[PDB]
Design a protein around this ligand. Structure first.
Ligand SMILES: [Mg+2]
Ligand SMILES: [Mg+2]
Ligand SMILES: [Mg+2]
Ligand SMILES: [Mg+2]
Ligand SMILES: [Mg+2]
Ligand SMILES: [Mg+2]
Ligand SMILES: [Mg+2]
Ligand SMILES: [Mg+2]
Ligand SMILES: [Mg+2]
Ligand SMILES: [Mg+2]
Ligand SMILES: [Mg+2]
Ligand SMILES: [Mg+2]
Ligand SMILES: [Mg+2]
Ligand SMILES: [Mg+2]
Ligand SMILES: [Mg+2]
Ligand SMILES: [Mg+2]
Lengths: 72, 124, 209, 61
RNA sequence: AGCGUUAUCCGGAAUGAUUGGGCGUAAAGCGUCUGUAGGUGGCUUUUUAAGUCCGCCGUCAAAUCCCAGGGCUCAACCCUGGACAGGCGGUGGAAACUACCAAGCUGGAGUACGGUAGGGGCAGAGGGAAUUUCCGGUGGAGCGGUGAAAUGCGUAGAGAUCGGAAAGAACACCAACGGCGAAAGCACUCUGCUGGGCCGACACUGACACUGAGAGACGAAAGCUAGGGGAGCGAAUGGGAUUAGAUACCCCAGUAGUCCUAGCCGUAAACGAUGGAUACUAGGCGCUGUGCGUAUCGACCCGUGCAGUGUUGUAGCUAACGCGUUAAG
């Protein structure tokens, strides 16, 4: 598949969502928790890049994926 | 990070190991820097090639002295200078490579040109 | 010599290589064979004295016969330290050793006991082992030749200390910066030794005039 | 260290260790003596050295 | 015609090291990781001219300092003239560099794929010996322990020896010059869910990078708060010895705790006593993981690339010891 910016966020959005349901049961899996914050951080720096390059794509991507916008 | 900070070292380490070739990276800035060492007599020859779309340059060092080098203006602290405070390394045995509005030149060439600039590295 | 024994120092003077064994370059050395024979031929005309340092068992007698052709000197056995640097002690042992050969001529051995004559016998025998090819030196040489760098590591350093040019064993075992004159390819066999040794000893003969 | 750390004022000078707080910087100072006596000095030396307990006008005993 | 003492400031003091220091062992790297602000940031062609450089204008009073000249019989001192350097503002130009603006690339980073090793983590099932206790059979005097002895167990039948019930905790051999993980740490077996790394390449992205003040998470044992469990070992506390003494070392018994599930505590020589990222800088040996090629193309072996992991060692550094491509260069 492609490697566009919005596509990487879509895969992380599923990779993140897939692990939340896992931690509801295996909450003591702290090694996976260290991996969960990576994908949460990788998308943070990509969306941080998408923001200052084009705000139109930002408002459209966050609207369909139901993403919380950051203050400041 | 700072390319030129790496350029000055790849030439330094080559003299400590006492090698002839360097295989230094090619850019718009380095081609002007190396061009000064040819005319000034610090390097015997330079030569260009490529392996990918990128480019490189191959130098030819000379065979108890040591090829001293030093960087001055860093990214964390840039250093500029006016005409009256142009350095004079070792009374003339050394030179300073500095960037003017009319490109890069030697400090001696700036003494005649009458225009200071950003000192980047000293040589002796 | 091998993949586990090649020194990276000789890399300018290497052409190719093979299955395990190493292949030396004969091109660069040929210039140095000329520079060597030119310097040795020119030096011999002025009347200098030379020295050869050979103690390898394979070329112990070859270096001995090599010195008889010219008026140079050889070192068949080990270096025993301070031969050239501690020359003041060497003159004492040579002045000593020179006298004992005159001591044996006299009939004083008769009036010495059995054991005392044995000590003087074994004393002179020990000096003959190490002070054979030096009996007619009477001074310090001006150029010193090294046949082996590894086994005679000490001899190469006193030359550097006293500031004397020299020839070395620039094959992959050693460091080439120790001698100004460079002649690789001598660790193969006597063929590599005699081909070079006889060639350099030959040049001394015509230089002597 | 890093120049950003220098801008934090990581470096400060050292304060004075003046050896006469009682004088309050003045060269001399008057005082009434309270009790004269002697005292044994440190171990290697040995003597009865003379001293005087003084009440200075600067508010120091 | 002053000389010394004391006090105060600077220097010496590179002893707060922008110029101009250091953190392996001398004082100094958070226990570790993720990340906000902040700092810095790959390459190529343009835009602007904020920074930066040049030329002019105004101004930073006088005195003082600096240079020259003059006047007190000289000097101090007084006077005349003129500064340089540096700061602010305006103005006209130069456009490399920092920065800005408009487009480009793929080497750094990441995604999609296709392969691959491992005690990565969590959860649930399965397995054997060994030890202990009880049940009995057999049998009859010691057993056990120590530098020597005793306490202690035992004819109310010990210990030993076969057979059997049950429980708890921990996994010999494999096992290292070994693997994984950010650390702390992870080893009897499988299975489930799940994280990370490495390599290949012809899908793609187009600098989306590094570090990280605060903050947050994880975090050996010990210990605490409830609820369970407790075989063995074992602080404490007793007893028997050694000793002048023995609130110890030794020996016999032994509580908490050691284990499980919830949570607190957040400390260790939490050490590689060495922060992280990146580029460059001789080699020798051999250990994995994954490719390539030769080869017996059955694997192997041999030869090389990449990412790691250990041991010697050159230059160089280091007060020295020692580090040394995984640097303390
Ligand atoms: Mg740049
Ligand atoms: Mg100071
Ligand atoms: Mg400093
Ligand atoms: Mg210091
Ligand atoms: Mg200590
Ligand atoms: Mg310390
Ligand atoms: Mg971070
Ligand atoms: Mg003024
Ligand atoms: Mg430009
Ligand atoms: Mg912090
Ligand atoms: Mg515990
Ligand atoms: Mg601590
Ligand atoms: Mg530990
Ligand atoms: Mg520490
Ligand atoms: Mg640490
Ligand atoms: Mg080493």
């Amino acid at each position: 598949n492609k490697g566009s910016v919005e596509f990487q966020v879509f895969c992380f959005t599923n990779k993140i969502r897939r692990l939340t349901l896992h931690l509801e049961l295996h909450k003591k899996d702290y090694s996976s928790q260290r991996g969960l914050r990576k994908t949460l951080g990788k998308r943070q720096r990509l969306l941080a890049y998408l923001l200052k390059i084009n705000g139109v794509r930002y408002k459209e991507l966050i609207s369909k994926l139901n993403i919380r916008e950051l203050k400041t | 990070k700072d390319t030129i900070a790496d350029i000055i070292t790849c030439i330094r380490n080559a003299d400590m190991n006492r090698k002839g070739t360097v295989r230094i990276v090619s850019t718009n800035i380095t081609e002007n820097i190396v061009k000064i060492l040819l005319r000034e007599g610090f390097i015997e020859n330079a030569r260009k090639h490529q392996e990918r779309n990128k480019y490189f340059l191959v130098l030819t060092l000379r065979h108890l002295n040591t090829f001293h080098l030093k960087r001055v203006s860093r990214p964390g602290l840039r250093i500029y200078s006016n005409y009256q405070r142009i350095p004079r390394i070792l009374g003339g045995m050394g030179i300073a490579i500095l960037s003017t509005s009319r490109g890069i030149m030697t400090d001696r060439e700036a003494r005649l040109e009458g225009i200071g600039g950003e000192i980047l590295c000293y040589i002796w | 010599h091998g993949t586990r024994k090649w020194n990276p120092r000789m890399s300018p003077y290497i052409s190719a290589k093979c299955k395990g064994i190493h292949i030396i370059n004969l091109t660069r050395t040929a210039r140095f064979l000329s520079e060597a024979c030119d310097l040795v031929f020119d030096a011999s005309s002025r009347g200098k004295q030379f020295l050869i340092v050979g103690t390898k068992n394979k070329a112990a007698d070859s270096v001995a016969r090599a010195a008889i052709r010219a008026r140079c000197h050889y070192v068949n056995k080990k270096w025993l330290g301070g031969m050239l640097t501690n020359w003041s002690t060497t003159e004492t042992r040579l002045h000593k050793f020179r006298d004992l050969r005159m001591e044996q001529t006299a009939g004083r051995l008769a009036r010495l006991p059995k054991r005392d004559a044995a000590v003087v016998k074994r004393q002179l025998s020990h000096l003959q082992t190490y002070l054979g090819g030096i009996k007619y030196m009477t001074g310090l040489p001006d150029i010193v030749i090294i046949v082996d760098q590894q086994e005679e590591y000490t001899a190469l350093r006193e030359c550097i200390t006293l500031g004397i040019p020299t020839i070395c064993l620039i094959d992959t075992n050693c460091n080439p910066d120790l001698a100004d004159i460079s002649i690789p390819a001598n660790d193969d066999a006597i063929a590599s030794i005699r081909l070079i040794l006889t060639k350099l000893v030959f040049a001394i003969c015509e230089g002597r005039s | 260290p890093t120049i950003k750390q220098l801008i934090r004022n990581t470096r400060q000078p050292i304060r004075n260790v003046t050896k006469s707080p009682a004088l309050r910087g003045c060269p001399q100072r008057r005082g009434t003596c309270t009790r004269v006596y002697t005292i044994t000095p440190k171990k290697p030396n040995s003597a009865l050295r003379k001293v005087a307990r003084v009440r200075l006008t600067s508010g120091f005993e």
